[PDB]
Design an enzyme around this catalytic site. Sequence first.
Site, mmCIF file in Angstrom:
data_model
loop_
_atom_site.group_PDB
_atom_site.id
_atom_site.type_symbol
_atom_site.label_atom_id
_atom_site.label_comp_id
_atom_site.label_asym_id
_atom_site.label_seq_id
_atom_site.Cartn_x
_atom_site.Cartn_y
_atom_site.Cartn_z
ATOM 1 C CG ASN A 182 10.458 29.313 -4.718
ATOM 2 O OD1 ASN A 182 9.402 29.931 -4.736
ATOM 3 N ND2 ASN A 182 10.505 27.975 -4.870
ATOM 4 C CE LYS A 188 10.018 26.812 -0.898
ATOM 5 N NZ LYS A 188 10.345 25.630 -0.032
#
Lengths: 246, 247
Positions: free
Chosen positions: B9, B11
Site C-alpha cells: 500500500n 498510499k
Amino acid sequence: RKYFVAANWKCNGTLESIKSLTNSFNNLDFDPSKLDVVVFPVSVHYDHTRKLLQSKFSTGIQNVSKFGNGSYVGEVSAEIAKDLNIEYVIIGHFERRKYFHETDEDVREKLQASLKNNLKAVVCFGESLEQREQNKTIEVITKQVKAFVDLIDNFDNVILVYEPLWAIGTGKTATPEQAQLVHKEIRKIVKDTCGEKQANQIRILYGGSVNTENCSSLIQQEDIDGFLVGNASLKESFVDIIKSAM
Amino acid sequence: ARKYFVAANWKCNGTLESIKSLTNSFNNLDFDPSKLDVVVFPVSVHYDHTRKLLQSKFSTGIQNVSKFGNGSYVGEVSAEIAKDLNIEYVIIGHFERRKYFHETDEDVREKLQASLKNNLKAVVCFGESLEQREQNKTIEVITKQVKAFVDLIDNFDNVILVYEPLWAIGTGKTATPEQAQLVHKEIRKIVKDTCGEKQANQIRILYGGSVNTENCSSLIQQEDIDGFLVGNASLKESFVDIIKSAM
Ligand SMILES: [Ca+2]
Ligand code: NA
Ligand code: NA
C-alpha cells in the site's frame, strides 16, 4: 483573454469509448492559441486520455488532495500531479461539496496546494434554490469567492465556474440573461478584490446545464467566458460546443 | 491451506522515477503467482505506469473505490470503470479514509457491494482504537465493523480482511505477534459465526499494522495471519524480503 471550454467527464468512460471520443475531438480544427479546450477524465483514465488527445487539448483531473505526499490512502497530492505534468485541476465542484463534505476551507487549501505546485485550477461555486429564493445569490457567491480569491497569482491560471445549483435537478432553468447577471457580479467581486486588470483577465465559466441546444445563447453573453460541461461532453457533438466559442 | 497474500500500500507516495526504480527491484524476486498473491496498490494516476512496469506475477489494485456507480460523481472511480480497466483489487475501509475522510461502516458496506457486483476483489480494513483496546472493547468493536459487510461476501477467495491495530499506529505502542494473532483468531470466529466454518477457514485475514523486514516472519508464522497490507516498508526495495517471508 481566451475562451475556455472544458469537458468534465465526471465518473464516466470506458477505454474504448474514450478512444472514439478523443478521435472525434481531434478531428476538430481549432486554434489553441485562441481557445483553451480542456478535458477532465477520471483519474485512472488520465494517462489513457492524454496519450490519445493531440497537444491542442489540455488535460486535468477532477479533484486534488489538500494534503501533500504521505499517509493519505486514496489521495492524489498536488506534488504527484506536478510530477506527472497534469496541467489542470477542478476544485469545489458542487458534487464534492454535496456528497463528499468538501468545505470552503478545503477549497482554499486545495487551491493553495495546487498553485504552489504550478497546477492551474478551475474553481467552482454557486447557490442553491433555497438561497436564491431568499435573495442570497450575491451573499453566497461573495462568501464562496472570498474563501480563495486572494490566493490567485497569475490570473490566466485560475478559472472561475458559476454553478447555478438552483437550476440543477430542481426543475428550474437558468436563462442566459440570469446567468449573465450573475457572471457580471462575479467579475465585479474580482475587480473590487484584485483589480480592474485582473478582473478583465480572469475567465468565468458557466457550469450549469450546457448542451448543443443552449450553448450559443450562453457563450455570447458578455461575462461568460466558456463552460465547464457535464454530460454533453461525453458526446461527439461536444465539438459543436467547442465551435460555439471559436 | 489458504493462499498467502502480501500487499504493498503505497498510499500517497511516488514519482515516475521512484516507481521505475522500485518496480524494477520488485521484479527481481522470483516467485510463483499461482501459489502466493502479491499485490501493489499505487496512487490512481500512477496505476497505468505501475501496471506497465511490474511483471504479471504481481497483481495490482487501487486504494479506494466509489460507492456510487457511473454518473454525476465528480472525482470518483466507479467499480465499473475499474473492471473495464481490468483493475483486480480495491482497498476499502482503510483507517485513513475512516479518519480523515469520514468513511463510515455504511460506506464500507456499499463499496464492497459495488465492487463484488463488478467482479472486483476487495481488501477490507477495520480495527480498534487505543481507547477501545484500553477499555477491553476490542472484540465488540471488531464484531460491529465486520458485521457491517460480511454477509455480502459472495466468494471467500475474493474478499480479503485486514486487521489494522489502530491502538499500535501513531500511539507509541507496538503490537506483538501474539496480540495480532489473538485478534485474527477472533476475526475468523466472527466469520465462522456469521457465514459458517468452511467460509471462515477459506478467508485470508491480513495483518495491517506496522510490518517491516524484521517482524514479518514472526507474524506470518501465526496460525490465523495470512499475510500483510504493508505501509512505509513497501516503498523500499527490501519489501521483497517481506514477500519472501510468505514463501
Ligand atoms: Ca464566434
Ligand atoms: Na462570452
Ligand atoms: Na500464518
